[PDB]
Amino acid sequence: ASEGPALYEDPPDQKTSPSGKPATLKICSWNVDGLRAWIKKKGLDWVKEEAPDILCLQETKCSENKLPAELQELPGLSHQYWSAPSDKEGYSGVGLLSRQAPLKVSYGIGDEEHDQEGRVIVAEFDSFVLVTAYVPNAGRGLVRLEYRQRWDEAFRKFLKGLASRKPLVLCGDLNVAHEEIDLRNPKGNKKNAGFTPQERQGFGELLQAVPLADSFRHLYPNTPYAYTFWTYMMNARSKNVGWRLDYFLLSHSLLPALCDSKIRSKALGSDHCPITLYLAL
């Protein structure tokens, strides 16, 4: 009620690094709010335009056994990996689609308690490891906040482990707006899922412990009104009343390779928009 529109125009794509090296890897991440719903809403149209080397999808709500045939319309992303809840129902779920086959693909974070909801794919490449995640929501009434804190700890320890061996890129819907600048209405959301002190602190703990850098915020430290999620309700997207919940977090060693971290604000198909990373590896 107190918010009107706040303008945000994502800056032009910077496709060369600070050292002059052209980007060699383009990764797009997108919480699609259901694979089938997204396809119906022409989500694949942005994918074809974006032409990433790797596409990471969250909330597919679909298992590897029941994928829509349309996913074959991505010939440039022929290596496709999917994780879904082990109860085999239609919720959560992540996907990773890649131009080249990774050296190894794994699922989950090595902890049975946290591996039953189809939330994580790990794809190891030559010079880096890519993780995509759909982090557990703290829930209406914060009924899942206690679980979320357990998840956060287990996830951080798992990622720290990976990073000790190879440079890490983590992407996906991390279900937290880190700082006040990361959502339109900080004051009124401090007791809501995605902006609790607990969740924000978990994010800070992740950055410190692994350690990892927030690619977007690294490049645009003072830029407000840059969001990746808007509730379907109340004309939130038209007014840009949103939250930045979707990130690319990078090992510090990858910062010299960082060209840009984009927010594709105008791409429709979900209640989240895509984010896109350019790296010169």
Curated annotation (Swiss-Prot):
Reactions catalysed: a deoxyribonucleotide-2'-deoxyribose-5'-monophosphate-DNA + H2O = a 5'-end 2'-deoxyribose-5'-monophosphate-DNA + a 3'-end 2'-deoxyribonucleotide-DNA + H(+); Exonucleolytic cleavage in the 3'- to 5'-direction to yield nucleoside 5'-phosphates; a 3'-end 2'-deoxyribonucleotide-3'-phosphoglycolate-DNA + H2O = 2-phosphoglycolate + a 3'-end 2'-deoxyribonucleotide-DNA + H(+); a 3'-end 2'-deoxyribonucleotide-8-oxoguanine-DNA + H2O = 8-oxo-dGMP + a 3'-end 2'-deoxyribonucleotide-DNA + H(+)
Cofactor: Mg(2+); Mn(2+)
Modified residues (S-nitrosocysteine): 28, 56, 273
Disulfide topology: 28-56
Phosphothreonine, modified sites: 196
Binding of Mg(2+) 1, residues: 31, 59, 271
This enzyme's EC code(s): 3.1.11.2, 3.1.21.-
Site, as annotated: Transition state stabilizer: 175
CDD domains (UniProt xref): Ape1-like_AP-endo (cd09087)
Subcellular location: Nucleus; Nucleus, Nucleolus; Nucleus speckle; Endoplasmic reticulum
Location of N6-acetyllysine modifications: 160
Chief place where the protein resides: nucleus
Top EC class, one word: hydrolase
Record's cofactor remark: Probably binds two magnesium or manganese ions per subunit.
Any GO CC annotation of this UniProt entry: endoplasmic reticulum
UniProt-annotated stretches for the region Mitochondrial targeting sequence (MTS): 252-281
PROSITE patterns: AP_NUCLEASE_F1_1, AP_NUCLEASE_F1_2, AP_NUCLEASE_F1_3, AP_NUCLEASE_F1_4
Domains as described in the record: The N-terminus contains the redox activity while the C-terminus exerts the DNA AP-endodeoxyribonuclease activity; both functions are independent in their actions. An unconventional mitochondrial targeting sequence (MTS) is harbored within the C-terminus, that appears to be masked by the N-terminal sequence containing the nuclear localization signal (NLS), that probably blocks the interaction between the MTS and Tom proteins.
Other observations noted: Extract of mitochondria, but not of nuclei or cytosol, cleaves recombinant APEX1 to generate a mitochondrial APEX1-sized product. The specific activity of the cleaved mitochondrial endodeoxyribonuclease appears to be about 3-fold higher than that of the full-length form.
Name of the protein in question: DNA repair nuclease/redox regulator APEX1
Gene source species: Homo sapiens
